[PDB]
Amino acid sequence: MQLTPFLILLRKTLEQLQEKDTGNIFSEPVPLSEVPDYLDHIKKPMDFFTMKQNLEAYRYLNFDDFEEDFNLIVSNCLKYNAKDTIFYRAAVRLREQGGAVLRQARRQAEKM
């Protein structure tokens, strides 16, 4: 397991996950200016831009740490937003579509 091919794969996987976020509602931190009470019960906010920064800082050296932050994007959104909102359903769909992306990516990593 070499570092450079692995990060190439995480970069490709991150792009495939962002592609599932057609609304771009997960690509940047939740704007605290518009959601001022957001950090009341969300102890670790997460988004795809932050994941890209963490990736390039070598903070993802295994698949599970990368997948954990993706799951955080999903779980934070399910936690904060009511079930009858667009945001909540978008997180459900991201969980479903992103899960398929991640399983295939992990198979490619397990070949390495």
Ligand X SMILES: CCOC(=O)c1ccc2c(c1)NC(=O)[C@@H](C)N2
Residues that bind ligand X (CB under 6 A): 25, 30-31, 34-35, 77, 80-81, 87
Tokens 């990736």 sit at which residue? Answer: 55
Q: How far is the CB of 50 from ligand X (least distance, A)?
A: 12
* Rounded Cα gap, residues 51 and 14, in angstroms: 8
Q: Choose between 45 and 108: whose C-beta lies nearer to ligand X.
A: 45
**Residue 61 C-beta: closest distance to ligand X, Å:** 28
| Closest residue to ligand X: CB criterion | 34
The Cα 68–Cα 51 span in angstroms is 10
State how far the alpha carbon of 9 is from the alpha carbons of 21, 81, 102, 108, 109, in Å: 19, 32, 11, 8, 8
Give the nearer residue to ligand X in terms of CB position, either 5 or 96: 96
Query: At closest approach, how far in Å is the CB of 109 from ligand X?
Result: 28
